[PDB]
């Protein structure tokens, strides 16, 4: 017999196996294509997702029905502290793919990456990098030898960065060490850029800019063990089914005498790595800039942090990328934001957006006010001080 009503599948067999990720920091599989003429800059940046908010702006799209017209949209504020470089690592190319031949660390690493190298920081004698930071006691001849071995060799040069986690309202105190590749030309210039940026910080006024399309890489919000009707999207069976109605009913045919890899079963849902592409930066805001949530149309001084903070996160007092639409991974997750792999030209990209209004009401309920001064003005005085 055939299917008797030929219909599409459920799910996608290219996102298999749907298991848990390795770590919570999703790897970047591919950095953008190298261009050996550009000035040296990073290809990705490690931020922390805070949450969403609403944006009123002017859609200016010729030939569209909403031309010159105000639309509301959802964006995610991803918190972004500045990020400090602690080492470089260069890869030579083999007939078995790339291979890291040497890595060079900084002089005096902070207590956020020294805390990354111990599972139990409290018992430990904190003796990481003693005999390595004693290699700067000389003139650096071993370390200049290491950089010469990177200069002579090593087709691509990646830079070990790490976040500044104690500038973040998380309670982790441990920074996520990572590798980010460099696109600037003439790899001597790459490794001299990295040598000049040892222990120096990197802000997102340099990596990302306004209106740019960025990809976003993170680990999905996990949901535990999950049955098949919500994991894949299978129909519920009717009310009359003995032994339940929330299943795939026919697993397989008689022959093949096995369960195929393509049928839908139960297991993990969520906590997978994902990459969502084509997300447009609506804002790049700074930490020392008072009134981050101010707009050229709104002109009222207020930060982007809502009334009573972002829910389960806290208060943005840092840099922030503010990117259109949803992003994989929930709040408080290490989101790696990446430059776009390809030159995009679509007139959905290349659109220059200045915002008009940022929503900063409380997300802890059906919020009503924008700033507490506005609440004190509309509600009036209360049983407190006056």
């Amino acid at each position: 017999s055939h299917r008797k009503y030929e219909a599409p599948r459920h799910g996608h067999l290219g996102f298999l196996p749907r298991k848990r990720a390795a770590s919570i920091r999703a790897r970047v599989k591919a950095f953008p294509k190298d261009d050996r003429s550009k000035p040296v800059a990073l290809t990705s940046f490690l931020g922390y997702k805070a949450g969403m908010t609403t944006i009123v702006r002017d859609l200016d799209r010729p030939g569209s029905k909403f031309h010159k017209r105000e639309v509301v949209e959802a964006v995610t504020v991803v918190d972004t502290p500045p990020v400090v470089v602690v080492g470089v690592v260069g890869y030579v190319e083999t007939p078995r793919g790339l291979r890291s031949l040497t890595t060079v660390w900084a002089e005096h690493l902070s207590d956020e990456v020294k805390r990354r190298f111990y599972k139990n920081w409290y018992k430990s004698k904190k003796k990481a990098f003693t005999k390595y930071s004693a290699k700067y006691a000389q003139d650096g001849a071993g370390i200049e030898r290491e950089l010469a071995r990177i200069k002579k060799y090593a087709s691509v040069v990646r830079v070990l960065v790490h976040t500044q986690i104690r500038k973040t309202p998380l309670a982790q105190k441990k920074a996520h060490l990572a590798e980010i590749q460099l696109n600037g030309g003439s790899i001597s210039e790459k490794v001299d850029w990295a040598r000049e940026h040892f222990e120096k910080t990197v802000a997102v006024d340099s990596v990302f800019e306004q209106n740019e399309m960025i990809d976003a890489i993170a680990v999905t919000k996990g949901h535990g063990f999950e049955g098949v009707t919500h994991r894949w999207g299978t129909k519920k069976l009717p009310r009359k089914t003995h032994r339940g109605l929330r299943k795939v009913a026919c697993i397989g045919a008689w022959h093949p005498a096995h369960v195929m890899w393509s049928v839908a079963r139960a297991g993990q849902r969520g906590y997978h790595s994902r990459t969502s592409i084509n997300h447009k930066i609506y804002r790049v805001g700074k930490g020392d800039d008072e009134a981050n949530g101010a707009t050229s149309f709104d002109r009222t001084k207020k930060t982007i942090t809502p009334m009573g903070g972002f829910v389960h996160y806290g208060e943005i007092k840092n840099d922030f990328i503010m990117v259109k639409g949803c992003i994989p991974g929930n709040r408080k997750r290490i989101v790696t934001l990446r430059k776009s792999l390809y030159t995009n030209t679509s007139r959905k990209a290349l659109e220059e957006v200045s915002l008009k209004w940022i929503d900063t009401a409380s997300k802890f309920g059906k919020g009503r006010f924008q700033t507490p001064a506005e609440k004190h003005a509309f509600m009036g005085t209360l049983k407190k001080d006056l």
């Binding site: 599409p8 009123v56 859609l59 029905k65 909403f66 105000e70 639309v71 509301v72």
Partner: protein, 136 residues
Amino acid sequence: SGNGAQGTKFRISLGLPVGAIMNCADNSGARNLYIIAVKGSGSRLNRLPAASLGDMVMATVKKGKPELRKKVMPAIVVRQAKSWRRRDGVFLYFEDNAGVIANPKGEMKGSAITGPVGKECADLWPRVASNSGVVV
């Protein structure tokens, strides 16, 4: 969308599957309409073709004149009562479903439309924009 419909209608919430009995809001004589299909719908296994505001349904008349009953005609849904999202921000919904008897080219069978008329169905269909009373 479709033939005779002018413009690219933005997607609103599908609120009227096949079987819904909406009010007929023009003075042709039908008291209520009955969806039997939706022009422009899709094909997917065990899924009712749902209409929306601005869509073009095929409709029969259950209450009304004898000349309109027992025959299949087109119609145009002009109120929804399922909350949809205009792009400027608001979610909105009318009180009760409505639609007007038409021909396949979009021309009206009646002369005047009672009740408010959603503006997604006034901009897409021009002839509804002529006979409409309260737009929005």
